[PDB]
């Protein structure tokens, strides 16, 4: 029963908190929490590889790709391990995130603890954008907020 947490802070007003829970080893992982300060609509939501925050979110590096695969939506087989799709922020900018992903894990080869949770500016196209940047980052835009994922329990 491993519990993690991440506090997304950034230069702008976007900030929030996202906890992770895993009951089993190499099983499903719950990802729940709340972001605020975003614009209304779809924002990118990824787990980038490096847990660096020296030069800001640009220090986070690319999406967590251990298997060396192309970019896609979370429900697709061809996707980065760190690809969690998009989040929605309502008229208040309050993105209530609740997700269950069995691709990520708090342990093993797909461990995301110590990696950088990153929310983006625009939406991810889930790898169907029809160009080269959709097959890498997913044209989600810039990196509004980012935080190091650490153990909560």
């Amino acid at each position, epitope marked *: 029963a491993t519990k993690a947490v991440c506090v997304l802070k950034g230069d702008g007003p976007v900030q929030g908190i996202i906890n992770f829970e895993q009951k089993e080893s190499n099983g499903p992982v719950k990802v729940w929490g709340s972001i605020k300060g975003l*614009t*209304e*609509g*779809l924002h990118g939501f990824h787990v980038h590889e490096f847990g660096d925050n020296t030069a800001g979110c640009t220090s986070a590096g690319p999406h967590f790709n251990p298997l060396s695969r192309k970019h896609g939506g979370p429900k697709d087989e061809e996707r980065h391990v760190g690809d969690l*799709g*998009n989040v*929605t922020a*309502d*008229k208040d900018g309050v993105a209530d995130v609740s997700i269950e992903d069995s691709v990520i894990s708090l342990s093993g080869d797909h461990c995301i603890i110590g990696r950088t949770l990153v929310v983006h*500016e*625009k*939406a*991810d*196209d*889930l790898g*169907k*954008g*029809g*160009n080269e*940047e*959709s097959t890498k980052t997913g*044209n989600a*835009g810039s990196r509004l907020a980012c935080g190091v994922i650490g153990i909560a329990q």
Partner: nanobody
Amino acid sequence: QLQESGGGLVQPGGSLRLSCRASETLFSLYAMGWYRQAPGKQPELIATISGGGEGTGNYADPVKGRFTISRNNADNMVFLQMNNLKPEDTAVYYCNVYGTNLAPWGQGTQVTVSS
């Protein structure tokens, strides 16, 4: 839910302006997309519009530099302006949300390119 219009017959080298009205619940997602559909293939995602304010637009490779996407928030409407049309663009165009599950498809608009 979706309401497409504005296409038709156009000689090679013309232009068109496709409009789609999308309901408030679909437009509040602020991640719209114009897809093209050739008989036999998949409705590939041509152009996307997402982001705050007037939103930022992205375009595929075959239309990079010819098409332009925009949106009216007060109207909940998406616009696509296609310039320098080629016969490869003859397709049925639809407008639907991207980044999340696709809403039920509208009627679309036919866009034919011949002289």
